[PDB]
């Protein structure tokens, strides 16, 4: 077992033993970027390879070359945490050694001077956190792995809809990793066409001519030969018996004094066998048989010296008699069949406008760049630069591989550019497909689908940077002088900087990590997308690619995918899934040799898995693991059916290996329909953390692996005892077996405290260990938000009853008692970050000064001398968090205000109040205040206060570290001295610092003493720097935007319990909205008088089929039962015996479940604590498909003295009388979505408007009016409410006079409207009349 597994244990039902445990869930994200940035000895993908691609860069013929030596990543400017505060990017400097060589003109190549410039900084690049996240501006962000069509050759069909004929079509497409696409396609006339990209269509052969192929050669490529012999007189023919197949005899087939075939007699296998064994190498044919046959090569008269017939031309009884008299004996003709071997290329030539290489190149250049005059150098350079350029083209490794593999080649690796043989082979294959041999692959198949990740894309971006800078290098090297410049003046910063900064900054893939929740983060980091650059779009792709493919098994989750605009264009990574070496997806399997199912794991990709017969995770094997039944359910090639006892090569690794980490957290999933299951696994990521993280009452067993593998918790790096435990920090003393010889050391984990998340929720760690407690290597030291003892708790369980309660639960709406809002269990904490901008206008600078025109003493009280709110001061909507004032000259009043100001003696201030007020309606406590001052502007009072405070706090925080670490080290030295030098009492007497001056007998112990000291001083000096830098980074003015003099960031912590209108659901996809909060008095109770927490609606259950939501209720009930029993025995303090007995009983449950429980545990100090944590309930694990069973749940119920029915009599808290029939009651885990009404509720009367078109628009976060759409208009039309409509689209919105002229009448008590004309139509009048169109309003 383990350590923190002593504090609690989940009861694990199910039979199937885990053959392979769950790996690191964050695997992909980390591994990828781990490959991107790294020093790679070779051209394997990485910054190295990216460099080696475009480099070296030489001037155009100028013999001045710039090559690349090596690169390095300097230490980050700010650490992960500091950078999260300041708001900069967590990034490392890119320092690269470049070399500029100037070749002495007139080769041999040797250089006059090569200046090797030291590392030149181009840009900084983002870094990945241990949690697989990036921080762009003070915010954790994630780059979603992309899934797209892998580079290579692709043979499609496109039948049906095309041309309505039904003759179908066949198209091939060569798609590289970069560069133009090469398409080959047929048409109804069987003419082979080719196009680059999506461009103009061209007859296929025209590419071959550009490759230097004459007609003769093309015909030599795509057609066999039929040899004719004019021997004696009157032509004969060579014959291979297989040729005659698929045809009926055109004449008398006879030779060798024996007539094999007659006319009108089709040639079957019989005639073929006869002619075959008889060995007929020659047959005489009529002079008329060549009337249709097409000549292969050219032909000329030796005498006349004229062209008799061009290559690829139909022979006639005329031309034949023309070339036969010339002496020609042999004539070559294409071997053509309209069934077996199709004459497509021959007919392609007849559509070919071109003749030679040049003409082809011209017709191509006038295709790619149509309309501009074609040139030789142009048409050459283009065609060479398209598919043959090492620069502008590549398939990469995946591309070359899939290419050769789909061409049935041998070599899995080769060049990134096409070869003549490549293109020609692809054409040959397309032809073969049209001929009836060979199949067509499909895009949806996961074997044709690749998966990128952060690293690849980052590499692509940095690459684009390198090319856009390459142009600059070659540009400057044009006119450059000798030693005057260096590889600095050329290479800029921005080209790399903004290039990578763009990607991480704005991309549909790059996005703010969704952090409300551990499962949210972890399921965001494992996510795939067919969208973004390189992929398709929502409107682009249809349902096909969206749909779950059979290949998605063990790779993609069939359930958890977003439901909406993009469905199936995202999905999620399966639990055990891995990115293939090439970047396909591969899944764990169990190799079955002979008749035994072996526990040896194997990784098969989408293509690898294809022919193999795979058994099922749900199957029965006993002892040595032989399949019980002689017939076992298995899926083999694309399909699934019953297979013979031993026909199988493989079996499923686990029960959960089909689903995803999110879908694996749904208990009794096998009992839920896939729709509502999707809804559930989608909503579970929307769970907001709670104030008291509880625990799942009904589990799976992934709840540990999730919270653990995610960064929310803090795991121990090494095992040992805890020296110190604080809500702030945790200090572990490292065990000797683990700990390194030098420096000794004790692991110090600094815990994260209350701080803002990306979702404006609260993220706060808490210590789960006590002072001086033993820990295991890799154990949970401190939990996170919504995490309990290593297990993931996304919400809180509670007492649930199914019964209609006076309609208050009517729809999916939920009715909850007051016991829940009282205990503050469902309460959540929110952290809002508000900012105040001090800018500069031509009218004057803005002041943050506390001196504000027109404010009360109650407003001025909450602020200090500097105008900043005190830390810890609780505020509500309208309070002044930060004072601000902006200069406004010449108030420019009217006589009424002139008289008013004259009488009341009020000087109109030259300044307007710009202060940042608390958003209306929200109320919280100020936790933290930050001040960013422009470099060079004098720091204000509060600024200095904050600065010095941070200085002292940093001094204490670093000093404490130095102290703990040093005491720990000296202790280790003192430990070494007593071995070989021993004086125990006599040692610690003299000053500690003196201990260093001591020696010891000759031994390795004298060396360790050297080490301890050698490292001591390191930590001694490493203090200085760690202080100095830390000091300076507090002092330096943070860089700001143009015009902003300083910025005050205030952090507010609001606490919201729960109220009607909030949305909360279960993991089964049953939504709900709290309707009323009912008194405990009116709450239905049982015979024990215990009120029920929540009353749901039983009507929602049958229609939306999730029966799991009931099972979770039943089991949970029984589960809590086992809690109460223990809670009794603990309250009655029986003994360590009875408790052990009952606990052992509960951990067994009938027969045949893998458990492995106690009596190893210490009889008192251990067991008694386990029961102590179990008194709240008995946590139960129900694996996805391996989960619990009816009778098991019922038996556990019997163990809890609860009924089998799971239904207990209830009583109305009002009349007290019984409810007829029982009601299902129990415990259901309920989350709380972040959809709380406090955010959702909006309203407006008359707000600010828009400048362009006068329309309602929120300026102050005072929400602009609701949108009235065309349909919403049709409603009013149908009703026939005319004035409602008019005012709706005129006076309440678009009418610039109407709005105010209305408002006046509104206050005056007169309800009317003087509508006028909406500004939209007026604007349209001006817009139309701006053109040559005269549009007027007429009549009267």
């Amino acid at each position: 077992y383990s350590y923190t597994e002593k504090k609690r244990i989940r009861k694990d039902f199910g039979k199937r033993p885990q053959v392979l445990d769950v790996p690191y869930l964050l695997s992909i994200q980390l591994d990828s970027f781990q490959k991107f940035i790294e020093q790679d000895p070779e051209g394997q993908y990485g910054l190295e390879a990216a460099f080696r691609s475009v480099f070296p860069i030489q001037s155009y013929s100028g013999n001045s070359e710039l090559q690349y030596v090596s690169y390095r990543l300097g230490e980050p400017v700010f650490d992960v945490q500091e950078c999260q505060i300041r708001g900069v990017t967590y990034s490392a400097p890119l320092r690269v050694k470049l070399r500029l060589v100037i070749y002495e003109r007139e080769a041999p190549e040797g250089t006059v001077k090569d200046i090797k410039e030291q590392e030149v900084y181009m840009g900084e690049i983002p870094l990945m956190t241990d949690n697989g996240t990036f921080v762009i501006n003070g915010t954790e962000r994630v780059i979603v792995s992309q899934l797209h069509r892998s580079p290579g050759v692709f043979f499609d069909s496109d039948k049906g809809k095309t041309h309505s004929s039904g003759k179908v079509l066949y198209n091939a497409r060569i798609i590289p990793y970069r560069g133009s696409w090469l398409d080959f396609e047929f048409d109804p006339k069987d003419n082979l066409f080719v196009r680059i990209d999506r461009r103009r269509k061209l007859p296929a052969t025209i590419i071959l001519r550009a490759l230097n192929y004459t007609t003769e050669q093309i015909l030599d490529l795509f057609f066999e030969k039929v040899i004719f012999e004019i021997r004696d007189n009157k032509l004969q023919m060579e014959l291979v018996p297989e040729r005659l197949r698929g045809e009926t005899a055109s004449f008398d087939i006879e030779a060798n004094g024996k007539v094999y075939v007659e006319k009108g007699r089709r040639i079957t296998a019989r005639h073929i066998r006869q002619l075959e064994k008889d060995d007929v190498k020659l047959i005489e044919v009529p002079v008329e048989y060549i009337a249709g046959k097409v000549v292969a090569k050219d032909y000329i008269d030796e005498s006349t010296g004229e062209l008799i017939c061009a290559a690829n031309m139909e022979l006639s009884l005329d031309l034949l008699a023309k070339l036969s008299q010339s002496g020609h004996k042999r004539i070559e003709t294409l071997f053509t069949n309209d069934l077996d071997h199709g004459p497509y290329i021959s007919e392609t030539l007849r559509v070919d406008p071109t003749n030679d290489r040049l003409s082809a190149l011209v017709e191509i250049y006038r295709m790619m760049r149509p309309g501009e005059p074609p040139t030789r150098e142009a048409a050459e350079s283009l065609f060479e630069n398209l598919f043959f350029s090492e620069d502008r083209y590549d398939l990469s490794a995946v591309g070359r591989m899939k290419f050769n593999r789909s061409l049935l080649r041998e070599e899995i690796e080769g060049s990134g550019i096409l070869s003549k043989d490549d293109i020609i082979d692809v054409m040959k294959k397309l032809i073969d497909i049209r001929n009836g041999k060979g199949e067509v692959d499909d895009i949806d198949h996961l074997g044709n689908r690749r998966i990128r990740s952060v690293g690849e894309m980052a590499e692509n971006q940095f690459r684009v940077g390198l090319v856009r800078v390459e142009r600059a290098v070659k540009e400057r090297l044009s006119l450059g002088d000798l030693d005057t410049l260096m590889p600095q003046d050329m290479i800029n910063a921005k080209p790399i900087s903004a290039a990578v900064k763009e990607f991480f900054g704005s991309s549909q893939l790059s996005q703010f990590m969704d952090q409300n929740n551990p499962l949210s983060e972890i399921t965001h980091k494992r996510r795939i997308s067919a969208l973004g650059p390189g992929g398709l779009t929502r409107e682009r792709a249809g349902f096909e690619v969206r749909d779950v493919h059979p290949t998605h098994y063990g790779r993609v989750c069939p359930i958890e995918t977003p439901e909406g605009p993009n469905i199936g264009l995202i999905n999620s990574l399966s639990v055990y899934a891995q990115t293939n070496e090439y970047g396909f997806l591969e899944t764990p399997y169990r190799k079955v040799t002979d008749g035994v199912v072996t526990d040896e794991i194997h990784y098969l990709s989408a293509i690898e898995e294809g022919n193999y017969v795979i058994a099922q995770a749900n199957s029965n094997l006993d002892e040595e693991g032989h399949f019980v039944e002689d017939l076992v359910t298995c899926r083999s090639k694309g399909e699934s059916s019953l297979f013979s006892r031993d026909q199988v090569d493989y079996m499923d690794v686990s029960t959960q290996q089909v689903v995803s980490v999110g879908a694996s957290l749904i208990p009794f999933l096998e009992h839920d329909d896939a729709n509502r299951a999707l809804m559930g696994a989608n909503m579970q990521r929307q769970a907001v953390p709670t104030l008291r993280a509880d625990k799942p009452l009904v589990g799976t067993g992934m709840e540990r692996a999730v919270a653990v593998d995610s960064g929310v918790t803090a795991v121990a790096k090494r095992g040992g005892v805890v020296q110190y435990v604080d809500a702030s920090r945790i200090v572990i003393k490292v065990n000797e077996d683990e700990m390194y010889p030098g420096e000794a050391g004790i692991d110090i984990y600094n815990l994260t405290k209350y701080t803002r998340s990306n979702q404006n929720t609260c993220i706060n760690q808490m210590p789960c260990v006590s002072l001086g407690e033993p820990v295991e290597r890799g154990d949970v030291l401190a939990d996170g938000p919504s995490t309990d003892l290593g297990e993931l708790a996304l919400g809180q369980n509670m007492r649930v009853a199914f019964m209609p309660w006076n309609g208050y639960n009517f729809e999916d709406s939920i009715l909850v008692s007051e016991r829940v809002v009282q205990e503050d269990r469902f309460t959540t904490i929110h952290i809002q970050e508000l900012a105040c901008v001090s800018r500069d206008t031509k009218l004057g600078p803005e002041e943050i000064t506390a001196d504000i025109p027109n404010v009360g003493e109650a407003a001025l009280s909450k602020l200090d001398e500097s105008g900043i709110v005190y830390i810890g001061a609780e505020v509500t909507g309208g309070d002044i968090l930060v004072g601000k004032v902006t200069p406004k000259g010449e108030t420019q009043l009217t006589p009424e205000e002139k008289l008013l100001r004259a009488i009341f003696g009020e000087k109109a201030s030259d300044v307007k109040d710009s202060s940042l007020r608390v958003p209306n309606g929200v109320s919280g406590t100020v936790i933290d205040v930050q001040v960013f001052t422009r470099d060079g502007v004098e720091k204000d009072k509060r600024a200095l206060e904050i600065e010095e405070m941070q200085l002292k706090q940093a001094k204490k925080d670093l000093s404490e570290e130095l102290q703990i670490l040093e005491a720990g080290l000296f202790s280790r030295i003192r430990a070494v001295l007593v071995a070989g030098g021993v004086e125990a009492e006599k040692l610690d007497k003299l000053p500690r610092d003196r201990w260093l001056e001591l020696g010891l007998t000759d031994e390795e112990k004298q060396n360790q003493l050297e080490q301890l000291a050698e490292q001591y001083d390191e930590l001694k000096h490493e203090f200085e720097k760690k202080l100095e830098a830390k000091r300076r980074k507090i002092t330096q003015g943070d860089d700001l935007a143009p015009g902003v003099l300083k910025i005050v960031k205030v952090y507010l912590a609001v606490k919201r319990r729960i109220q009607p209108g909030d949305k909360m659901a279960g993991r089964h996809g049953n939504k709900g909205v709290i309707s009323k909060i009912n008194p405990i008095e009116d709450m239905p109770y049982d015979e024990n008088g215990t009120p029920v927490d929540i009353v749901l609606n039983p009507l929602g259950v049958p229609s939306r089929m999730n029966i799991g939501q009931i099972l979770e209720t039943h089991l949970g009930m029984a589960a809590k039962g086992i809690g109460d029993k223990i809670n009794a025995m603990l309250k009655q303090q029986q003994e360590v015996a009875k408790l052990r007995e009952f606990i052992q009983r509960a951990y067994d449950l009938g027969a045949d479940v893998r458990q492995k429980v106690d009596l190893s545990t210490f009889s008192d100090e251990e067991v008694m604590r386990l029961a102590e944590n179990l008194r709240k309930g008995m946590p139960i694990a129900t694996p996805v498909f391996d989960g619990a069973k009816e009778a098991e749940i019922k038996e556990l119920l019997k163990l809890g003295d609860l009924p089998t029915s799971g239904q207990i009599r209830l009583y109305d808290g009002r009349t007290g009388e019984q409810f007829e029939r029982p009601v299902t009651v129990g415990y259901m885990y309920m989350l709380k979505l972040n959809h709380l009404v406090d955010d959702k509720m909006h309203a407006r009367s008359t707000g600010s408007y828009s400048l362009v078109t006068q329309q309602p628009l929120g300026g102050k976060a005072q929400f602009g009016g609701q949108r009235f759409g065309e349909m919403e208009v049709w409603a009013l039309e149908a009703y026939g409410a005319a004035y409602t409509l008019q005012e709706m689209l005129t006076v309440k919105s678009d009418d610039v006079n109407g709005r105010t002229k209305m408002y006046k009448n509104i206050v005056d008590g007169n309800h009317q409207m003087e509508p006028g004309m909406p500004e939209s139509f007026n604007v349209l009048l001006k817009e139309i009349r701006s053109l040559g169109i005269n549009i007027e309003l007429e009549d009267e």
């Binding site: 039309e1277 009703y1279 004035y1283 008019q1286 009418d1295 509508p1315 004309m1317 909406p1318 169109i1333």
Partner: protein
């Protein structure tokens, strides 16, 4: 068909809503078309009382006063 039948509307301002705007505007411009409203969409556009329901009376009285004494 309904999609085809919707194509014919006397009011051009109405046509500029659903149909291709450019074409309609030009095609109506050359002919010097006169859009008299009388319909729903064309009226909603210009922000006047719907010639139906509560406003059918208004548009009626107006239509009657129009093209008369």
């Amino acid at each position: 068909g309904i999609t085809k039948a919707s194509l014919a509307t006397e009011s051009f301002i109405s046509a500029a809503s659903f149909q291709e705007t450019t074409r309609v505007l030009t095609e109506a411009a050359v002919a010097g078309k006169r859009d008299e409203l009388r319909g729903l969409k064309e009226n909603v556009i210009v922000g006047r009382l719907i010639p139906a329901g509560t406003g059918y009376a208004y548009h009626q009285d107006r239509m009657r006063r129009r093209a008369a004494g």
